[PDB]
């Protein structure tokens, strides 16, 4: 939540947004 425990650069950050951007709740 606060930050990813993974030392990733923006893995989920750029990707997970894509997932949501594809979900489009409203």
From Swiss-Prot:
- Cysteine disulfide links: none
The Gene Ontology biological process annotation of the record reads: sporulation resulting in formation of a cellular spore
Result for mutant: residue 15 to A: Specifically impairs cortex assembly, but not the initiation of coat assembly. Strongly impairs sporulation, but does not affect localization
Practical applications: Nanomolar concentrations inhibit biofilm formation in situ, in S.aureus and in P.aeruginosa, suggesting it might be useful controlling bacterial infections.
Reported effect, residue 4 to A? Strongly impairs sporulation, but does not affect localization
Membrane topology per the record?
A: Peripheral membrane protein
Important for localization: where is this region? 3-9
GO CC aspect terms: membrane
Q: Which UniProt keywords apply?
A: Membrane, Sporulation
Answer yes or no on keyword Ribonucleoprotein. Answer: no
What effect is documented for mutating residue 6 to A? Causes mislocalization and strongly impairs sporulation. Does not affect membrane association
Give the induction text.
Expressed during sporulation and is regulated by the mother cell-specific transcription factors sigma E and SpoIIID. There is a lag-phase of approximately 2 hours between the onset of transcription and translation. The 5' untranslated region negatively influences its own translation.
The note filed under miscellaneous reads:
Preferentially localizes to slightly convex membranes. This preferential adsorption is accurately modeled as a two-step 'dash-and-recruit' mechanism: first, an initial binding event occurs with a faster on rate, then cooperative recruitment of additional SpoVM molecules follows.
Domain notes, please? Residues in the N-terminal region are required for proper localization.
What is this protein's function? Answer: Coordinates cortex and coat assembly during sporulation. Associates with the spore coat protein SpoIVA and with the outer forespore membrane, thereby serving as a membrane anchor that tethers SpoIVA and the entire spore coat to the forespore surface. May also serve as a competitive inhibitor of FtsH activity during sporulation.
NCBIfam families given in the database record: PRK14741.1, SpoVM_broad
What binding partners and quaternary form does the record give? Interacts with SpoIVA. May interact with the ATP-dependent protease FtsH.
State what protein this is by name: Stage V sporulation protein M
